[PDB]
Each structure stands twice: as C-alpha cells, then as structure tokens.
Amino acid sequence: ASHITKDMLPGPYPKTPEERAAAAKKYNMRVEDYEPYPDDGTGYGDYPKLPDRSQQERDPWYDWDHPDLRLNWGEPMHWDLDMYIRNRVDTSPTPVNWNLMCKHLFGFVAFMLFMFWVGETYPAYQPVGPKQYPYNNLYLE
Amino acid sequence: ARRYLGDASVEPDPLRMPTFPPDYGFPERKEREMVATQQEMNDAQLVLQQRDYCAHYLIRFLKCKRDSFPNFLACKHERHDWDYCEHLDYVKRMKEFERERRLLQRK
Amino acid sequence: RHSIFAFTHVLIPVWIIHYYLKYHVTTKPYTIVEKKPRIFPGDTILETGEV
Amino acid sequence: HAFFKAMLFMCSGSIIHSLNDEQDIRKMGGLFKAMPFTTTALIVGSLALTGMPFLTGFYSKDLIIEAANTSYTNAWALLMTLIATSFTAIYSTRIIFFALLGQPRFPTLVNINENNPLLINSIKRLLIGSLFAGYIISNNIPPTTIPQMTMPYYLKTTALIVTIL
Amino acid sequence: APPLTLEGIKDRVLYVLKLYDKIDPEKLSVNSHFMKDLGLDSLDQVEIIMAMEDEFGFEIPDIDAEKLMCPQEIVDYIADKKDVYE
Amino acid sequence: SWDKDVYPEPPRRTPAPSPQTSLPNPITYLTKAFDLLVDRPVTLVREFIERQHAKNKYYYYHREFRRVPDITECQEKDVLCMFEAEMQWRRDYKVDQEIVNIIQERLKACQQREGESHRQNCAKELEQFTQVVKAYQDRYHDLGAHYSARKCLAKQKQRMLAERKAAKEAAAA
Amino acid sequence: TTLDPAEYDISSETRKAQAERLAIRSRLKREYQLQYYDPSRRGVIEDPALVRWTYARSANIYPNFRPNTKTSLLGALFGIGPLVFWYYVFKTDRDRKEKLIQEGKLDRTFNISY
Amino acid sequence: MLKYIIPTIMLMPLTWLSKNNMIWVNSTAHSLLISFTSLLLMNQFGDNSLNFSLLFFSDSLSTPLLILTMWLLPLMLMASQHHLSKENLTRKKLFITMLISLQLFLIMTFTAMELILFYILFEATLVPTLIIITRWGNQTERLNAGLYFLFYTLAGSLPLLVALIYIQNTVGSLNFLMLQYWVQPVHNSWSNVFMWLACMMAFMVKMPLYGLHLWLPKAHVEAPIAGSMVLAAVLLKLGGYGMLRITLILNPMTDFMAYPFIMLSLWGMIMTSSICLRQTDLKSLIAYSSVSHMALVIVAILIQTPWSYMGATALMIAHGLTSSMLFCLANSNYERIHSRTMILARGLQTLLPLMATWWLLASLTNLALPPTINLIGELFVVMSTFSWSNITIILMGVNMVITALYSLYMLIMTQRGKYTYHINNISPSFTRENALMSLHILPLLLLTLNPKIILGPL
C-alpha cells in the first residue's frame, strides 16, 4: 500500500521536474522526451500530468531482447506506456502503402464492363452488323 | 415444337406440357418428332432434363445397369450409340446459325 | 485373439440398436420413409408388363 | 480430392522429420538421398495436380472445364478459370526443382530415416486407393445429367496443352 | 531422438580452421586467440564463424562477436545453448 | 399403433428378380447369412419379455371433458362464468396447434415416398395444407395479440372485425 | 501504413553526454534482482508501475476532468449521435411496412409463423 | 409455497444454536435437503393454471425460476469460507443469518399472488445486500458504491407506489392477477404516458439500460469475501422480472413509445460489450458481460408475441448459471495471487491443469455451441426480432461477433508461460475448489436434454 505518488494530479505544469522522478521514473531529469508534460489536449480528463502517454510507441515485439525480460515476457520494472493493444500489434514492413490492393480488384472493376456482355460459345464475334441476330428468324416454313 | 395450350390440370413442374417439353423443338425438319410414354415417364423415377429426346433408348440403356448387376459395362457400344443418338440430335440443333445467319439476310 | 476384443466392440450394440428399431416402426406413425422402386419395364411382385 | 493432400501432407511429413526441421523449399537438394519411396509418391499426386492425363480426378477435372465449354458465363470467367489451370503446372515442378532436383545443400549430420512400417502401411494403402478411385466411382454411379459430348476444331483439346506449356 | 557428445564439437570447429585457406594446419588447437594471425578488423570477427553460419548457424546474436576472440570461448557456450553435455 | 386413414401411404409395389447373368453377385452371400446372426438374440429375447410382460396388465383411461358453456356467456362483471369460457377456450387452442402438426407430417409422407417427380403427383397436399393454414391465422391466431393469449377478450374481436368490417362494408356486399 | 517506423537515424555528436540513462534502469534492476532473489519470499513483488497503471486509468480521470473544451463536448456527436440515426430508420420501417400490411397483402397463405 | 418459507426460517435458529466450527457443516447439511422439497409439490400441471393456496401464492406457475434461488445458500457457504475464517464466530454467525434472511423474501417474491405484495417484497431486499457490501469488502470505494447501489433503485421504485395505489382504487383492486380479467385499455393521452412510464422505469434501474447502468460496475467490482453476495446480486438483477407480470396486461396497447427503450437498449447492446475488451480489472471484465446479454431481454419483453417468451425466459436462467460460475472462477484464483489485475496472473495452464476445463466450459457457453440452454435462448430471440424488422439481424449479429472475440480474451491470457515470479501459487486447486466450481455445468448441460421445464406459458 503506497500513498506517496499514488498516481498523477491535475497537470501537466505542476513543476514537471518534481514528478519524474519523485517516483514513476518516466524521465531522468525532466529532459528525456518523457517528462510528464504530455497532457496532449487539455480539457479532456484523460491523461493528466500522468507518467504515461504520447511517448514513443507502436510495438514491443519481443524480439531477441537479451538484457533480461526486456519486452513483453519477463516483465521489466517500470516501462508500461500504453498497453492492451500492444500484446498484438507489430513493426514496419518492406515497401510502403502504394495501395495496389484496391488496384488489384480494379482489374475486375474494368471487367465489370465484361459483365455487360454474354459468353456464347457458338459462334465468335461477328460484331459489326445485324447478321448475328441472337434469336430465330421466320416461322415453320 | 409441340404443345397446344390451356393445361387442363393445374399441375406445375412442366410435365403439364403439350406432350413432352423439348429444349426448343421441333422446328423445321422435322416439324414434328414424337416422344416416349408420359405414363411411363412418371412411372420411372426420373428427373427433369431427362424427358428430352433419346430418353426411351436411355430408359432401356440404364435398365441393364441393374439387370446386369455386378458388371463393369452394360453396353459400351450402346453408350456410343446413345451418344450417336445424342450427336445426331445435337447436330440437328446446330443448324440454327447455318440458317439464321442466312435466313435473316435479304431476299 | 481378435476373439474377445472384437466381439465385445461391435456385435453387442447391433443387438441393442436393432431392438429399438423393429419395435419402433409399428409404434411411431412414421417409420423410415423409403422411396419408390424406379422401374423401367414391369415384373417384380406385381404382374404388369410393358413393351 | 480427399485422397490427394492427406497423402501429400503426410508424404512431406516424412521429409520435415527427416531433416528434423526445416519445412523450407530452400536448403533441400535432390530427390534420391536415400528417399526412394516417397519421391515416387510425390511424382504421382503432383502429376495428378498437373491436370490429369489419365490419373484419378480426370473424371472430375476434364468433365467440368468441358462443362464450361458451352455456357452463358461472364466470358471473363473462362478467361479466369482456364488460365488458372496453366498456373497449376508450375506448382508441380517447383517442389521438384528445389527439393527433388538440385545438388545437396543443407547443414550437415544427415540424420535421415524412412523405415518405420507405420508410415509404409499408411502410404501403400492410399496410393493404391488413389489410382483406382474414379475408375470405380464414376464407373459405378447413376448419371443425372445430359453430357456435352461436342468439342469442335481448334477449341477442344488445348486444355491439356494449357498444362503442357 | 539423436543424442550428442562433446567430442564432435571439438573436431568441427577445428576442421573449419583447415577448411579455410587463409589458415594453415600449423596454428594452435584450442587457443590461437584469432589475433595471432587474425586480420583485419571486419572479416576476421564475423567471417571466422561465417562457415559455421551455414553449418551450425542458429542465428548467432550480436553478443557472440567479442567473446569469440578466445577460440576456446566459442566452444564454451555452444553447449549452453543447444542443451548439451551434462 | 394407429389408423392408416390419418397417416396414409400407397401400397408397396416393389419390383424383384432381374439377374440375367452368371456374373458373380454378392447379394446371395449377404442376406442369407447375417439375418440369422441377429435373429437369435432379438426374436428370442423379445418373445421372452412378451410373455413376461403378459404376466400382468396395467390400465389407463381416456380422459374426456364436459362442454356445457361455450362462447358469448356471460355478463361483463362476472368472473366465474368467464373463467369457464377461458377453460373452454384454451383447450380449443392447444388442440388446434397439433392438427396443424398432423397435416404437416402428411406433407412429409408423400415427398419422401415419391421424391423424383414430387410436384405433379400426389395431387392433394399442397391443396389441402394451404387451405388449412390459410384457415389458421385468420380468427384463430391473435396476430398480434398472441402475447397475453387474450382468451375471449380478443378472440371474439378479430371475429368482430370479421363481421363488423367484413361482409357488409365491402360497398356493396 | 502505420507506421514509418524510423529504424535508422544519425548521432555523433549531438549531445554526447546523454549517457547513463542506463544507470536508471541498472539501479532498478539491481534493486529488482536483489529483491527477486531471497530464500523465503513466497509471494509477488509489488512493482508499482502496475499500480500507477491501473489507478491512473480506473480512477483519476473524473477528478482530473473539467469540461473546459469542446472536444469533451464532442461526445454529443458520438453518444447521442448514432442513437438519433437508429430512430430515423426504424420508424420508416414498421410504417411503410405497416401500410403495405393493411392496404393490400404481401405475405402468402402459409404464414402461420410469424 | 405451503411451507418452503417455514423450513427455511427454521434454518436460522440452528446456526447460533450449534457448537464451535461445526457451524459450517450444520448449515450446509440441512440446506441441501430443501432441494427435494422445492421440486416436490411444484412442477405440476399445467393447463390454465395452478393457483396455489391463498393470497400468498400463485405457485410461480408458468415461470419456474425459483429452484435456482434455493441452490445458492448451499453454494455460497462453501464458497465464502476461503477468506472469512479470520473473524469472530459471533460475526460468522451473523453473515450466515442475513444470507438466509435474503432467501426468505425472495421465496415469497417471484410468486407473490399480487402486485402490491410484490413491491413491498421487491423492496424488502436491499437492506441485507447493503450490509454485505459495506462491511466485508476490501479497500475503499465501498462506501460511495454503497450509496450508488441505493438512490437508483430507491429513486425509481417510489413512483411505483404512486401508480400501484392508483390502480387499487381505480379499477376494482389489484390484489389478484386473476381478477385482471376485466381490464380497460390504455389509450394515447398526456397522463397515460406517465402511468406507463413510472410503472416501467423502476424495473429499468435493476436490469439496466445503456444509460443508468452506472451502479452495476460499482457493487460488483468492490465485492464481498468470495463473490458471496455477488452470486446473489446476479439473481437479484434477473429477479426484477416482474415486467413479465405487469406489461403483458395492465396497459397492454402501448407500443407507441417503446421506441426510445428499443433503440437505447439495442444500440447500447452493441456498444457496452464492445467497451469491455480493454478492461484491466478481471472482475470488471465479467461485470460488463452481465450488462450486454442481460439487456437483450429488454428488447425481448417489449416486443411481445411469443417465440420470444420461449427465449426470454430461457435467457434469464441462461447466465443465471453461467455468470455465477464466472464470478466463482474469479473468486478463486484471487486467493493465490492477491490482485485482480488480469496482467499479473500469467504463467498459468501448466501449474493448475485440472481447472483448464473449468475455464473453457464456462467460456464455451458464451460461444454457446448450440445444444446448450444458451443458443436455444438466443435463436428464439433472433427469430423473434427478425419479424419486427429485418434490419435488426445486423446489430444482433455483430453482437454475436464481438462476444466471440471477448470471451476468448479471458481464456487466452492464461495460455502463456515462464511465470517470472511467484514463489507462492502452490495450492493445486483443492477438493472444495472443484466442488463449488462443479454443480454449475452439471445442471447446465443436463437440462438441455428435455428443456420443456424451462418455458413460459408461452
């Protein structure tokens, strides 16, 4: 049961060097890119002075990580930044966006113009005159 | 090519036909062509798209499948003859665009 | 043996599961709902003939 | 189809244990590095997957691509089904050309073994059941539909040559 | 299922000394320390295990470089990783 | 069992013979052996209970009720006679559920017995059943007062709309 | 596509005296390993990085909160927002559906259920 | 009830009358014996109807619902003994007696013969629950949560008395539900809105809408010894069923203003289960599951015309057994690790193998695997509100999607390893820990054979 520095207070400009770290060592001497200034967007009750958010992100992927536990399995001491989206989210790929996936289905979007026609096997084209005439001509005889 | 109209009974599933529904029928040569027995076609448990032509030859063909039970071929040449019933039926139908391309031209 | 291992497995329930079957078609007003014979000509247990 | 890959997973399952793990198409080598039986079983089903010259599902594969012969289709559908048949051929020789062709390249201590009759009883039943499957099933079956049985000149047999290229 | 002993790891490390044409079969057995005739900077620190990168080669992390100077210190912790001798 | 007029079927009409060949048929090997292996442990045991069950008998009777009052009785502030008119009424709705169950099984009877044609034949079921279900939700199903089941407080008043609106207000029928 | 993710950059010599940030985490790990090894513990360590993670997320949002902005008054575009739209749909059905049900018929004879 | 209340009051001068530590075995022995007698005269027939004795019972005829109320006193005493056994026997005798005193009023409730006998017993609770909330919890936020549990339930229930006394001197007397044959209809007015609204809103405060659910993750989060009244508070929530007794009659023709209760509780259903996947307190994870597929009955009661009452009754005791056991899964595995943080309990599934089945067969009832009592309940609700409007399959279908990803997220957090810590957590799930975790699924899958016992009138 710890009462001194239990959590944050209404910040984030309450002499920020006193916060990290009295406890909650988010910053070393309030210049660590994680000094508890980051109340991004005041007026929201979410994330006060808060040894917490908009810190660098996107994914402790639990790779080699040989200091010790380091990442996600083995539990280092004080490194929780924002979680519950990060035990299932990873890093950067090869290339970049070039959204060819919508362009991949665009090939049949052009072939939706081939959905307008038919596929009759006999005969071929003969597309220039009225000799084709899909249905029958005269009556019995 | 057959038919007549005003089906007496209101029985759907087009067995209510003139006699027998063809694919198109008849149409010219011959302008008529007949069929099997509808009282036997319903007596034989047989689905639609099998009440077309060459059915009576097939009703005698597939009978030998059970009439020769532990067999590998009831009649393989008749299968080539039922196909010859089928191919002569189908090339009779293939002469549409031989005519319809020409009969739709001026005269 | 292949004698008491095989006979205990299959042979006993077929005695059981038949007994809830023959004593069952006459009780329930629909038994198994078997289809027709699919005949071409005509003979079998009738008499009718065909050409 | 059910006789194909339960063979073929189990056929290659003898290979992954044989190197104790790689499951990569790299780092394999050729066919006969004391692998007589399963490479013979590989060249049957991967020849079935070519498009069936006389094999098992010839009575399933050929009769459907020649059921799309006369049809009211999209006309881009036959420009998408029959082109996919040609792509099924390079499926075959790819596992040949990396696992069954090349010089032996993989890290050492060749710890291969194939002689457990549990596996040999497994494959020898299904490979025999593979070949004579459709020639019993399709030979002994009630026909329900009217077949096509028409395929004129320059339009008929190229579906094999689709696989040959 | 195949086990292993410690007499095989002493040979393979020693053999790829002889497989390299830069190094003669006249250097010491377990401790030539690499610097005896190791050169230069790059390609005498990671290339010296680039032959075992193909053979053993279980991804060999960044810590493995400067421990590998002592050529017996290579032999030390390969037995620790792959669950080896007693 | 039952009575076959409630649950009809046509005869059996089962063909037979048709061998015609000296090709080896396994049907003589199958039915001429396995029928006896089941005949001993079934027929002898079922008969053994059948005398043992005929040692003594037990009785249960038909339960027929009394129907003196019917519908429009009684006066509004009464409770007693308007309890009996609901005890009348609820039995006339659990029963009329099950008569739809009987006719539906009659539709199940023809279709697995013919199967192949199944549409142009049997001539009766799709005419009978849709003249009963179309005679169901009218006046016998409080749609949508089905929640409280509204015995005689609404079961008459669909049928009031079937008299006060129907048959006179058609202008001019 | 989410994200760049900036896996290489420059240094040497932008603020070279930035070191011994590891001295923070080595102090914690020397505190932790001396805490973690002991012959009789029988129970977890507190580790208040979890304690400050729940209690600054469960409570301490409403004592923090002041409605000084309009991005917390944005919730009328999110709370009562779509709930307006679901009422607009459901009374167009059950009214257009209703008139067709009374004036004219749409269902068949075999609709006992319902 | 002839005498079910009369033996279960005789349980009360047995506990203090006993000796020393025998007080646990003496109470649980006799309390199981009522379960024969509870079944005994009840479940009779059956066609309009069973008025039972007098002005004290209509026997809970078409809605049984009451056998489940009698399992629990011999289910909670075996559950509560985990961390209770450090206090005095003089208070250990208390906590058994008020728990019986909660079962006494629930027995005359659900049957109740009237509507004004209902209310005074509908409000006869909330005094013995509040004693279990304030005393016998853990660290603070008990006391405000002791006040949030009041002042929603009590602010709403007082306009019942204004309306129920109003009916008693308007149309005859309400004293019987079977003098409700004469019912005048309730048309569209400006006073008949409020008669409908005040009579309805006091039931919404217990089975919550999306609004005014603000007390439900307060009392369940900060909660007694081992779910000991939390098992009771899940029955008590579904023991606000009496909307089935009222709204079937007694203003039957007001669907005109059902729509702000439909859309609030049909869109809230798709959101209040979605708002739980980022929970970090384990007992608050279950506490929002209890919001979501309880609020499916609120769109199942207001939509009338059964094939819904087939399912709306089966859903009241669907998670009567499910959500009870999930609290028992979390009242266990907290005795060993002293936090309810879901992060901390990892490294599991190797250490306690026998209770892996107890996780899954719990969470396989929310996936609900159709031959259970669960997807015989939802698939009557689905086929009911389809016939209201076709578009409701979308929201209720996405309800089925997210709760699939929701239930497994509580399972899969235990399938990890290496445990990093924890010289404690030795106790290999003793004989009591599996016994009170059993008797939940053992009736739950049993009744799926002949579930004609679980049906309304209907």
Add this chain to the structure above:
Amino acid sequence: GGGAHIEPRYRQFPQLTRSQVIQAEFFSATMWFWILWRFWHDSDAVLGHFPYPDPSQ
C-alpha cells in the same frame, strides 16, 4: 540412443535398406501399365463430328 540401425552421416550418402527400392520400383510399373486404357483403347473425343452443315436448303 537405443538402436543405431540407421547411422548419422557426414555426407557419405547413407543408403537404403535394400528392400525399400523394391517397393519403390514396383509402383512405377503399376502406373505405366495403367497407361493401357489411356491409349488402348481411349481416344481424344469419341463423339463423331459434323461435316460443316452448310447445304441446308
């Protein structure tokens, strides 16, 4: 381990058990005998064709 009936190697090509090759060569013969009904007798399309039905007048 227990039985070393197939020894590990240093790339010296451990061979077969001199009976596996018999079953191996037996199931190449059963399929190339099974090319019998592929050619003898089965053709490309045993249907018959049309001789260009132009004279329909």
